[PDB]
From Swiss-Prot:
Organism: Saccharomyces cerevisiae (strain ATCC 204508 / S288c) (Baker's yeast)
Family indicated by similarity: Belongs to the dynein heavy chain family.
The organism's place on the tree of life at top rank: Eukaryota
Subunit structure: The dynein complex consists of at least two heavy chains and a number of intermediate and light chains. Interacts with DYN3.
Note: Present with 195 molecules/cell in log phase SD medium.
UniProt lineage: Eukaryota, Fungi, Dikarya, Ascomycota, Saccharomycotina
Role played: Cytoplasmic dynein acts as a motor for the intracellular retrograde motility of vesicles and organelles along microtubules. Dynein has ATPase activity; the force-producing power stroke is thought to occur on release of ADP. Required to maintain uniform nuclear distribution in hyphae. May play an important role in the proper orientation of the mitotic spindle into the budding daughter cell yeast. Probably required for normal progression of the cell cycle.
Ranges that cross the membrane: none
Protein name per UniProt: Dynein heavy chain, cytoplasmic
Coiled coil: 17-41
Subcellular localization, as worded in the UniProt entry: Cytoplasm, Cytoskeleton
Domain topic, free-text comment: Dynein heavy chains probably consist of an N-terminal stem (which binds cargo and interacts with other dynein components), and the head or motor domain. The motor contains six tandemly-linked AAA domains in the head, which form a ring. A stalk-like structure (formed by two of the coiled coil domains) protrudes between AAA 4 and AAA 5 and terminates in a microtubule-binding site. A seventh domain may also contribute to this ring; it is not clear whether the N-terminus or the C-terminus forms this extra domain.
């Protein structure tokens, strides 16, 4: 409704960067959880991007 897309797009991009930095630094059990969440957060980025 507002068309905030730029602000929310950049915001989510950081979220993904966050998740990836922590992905590298994290145990193999939560590694799977974090890669799993990225698959979904990436799609958020992709749609807001579209």
């Amino acid at each position: 409704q507002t068309n905030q897309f730029s602000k929310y797009w950049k915001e989510v991009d950081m979220k993904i960067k966050g998740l990836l930095d922590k992905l590298n630094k994290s145990s193999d059990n939560v590694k799977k959880k974090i890669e799993a969440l990225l698959v979904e957060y990436l799609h958020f980025n992709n749609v807001i991007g579209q």
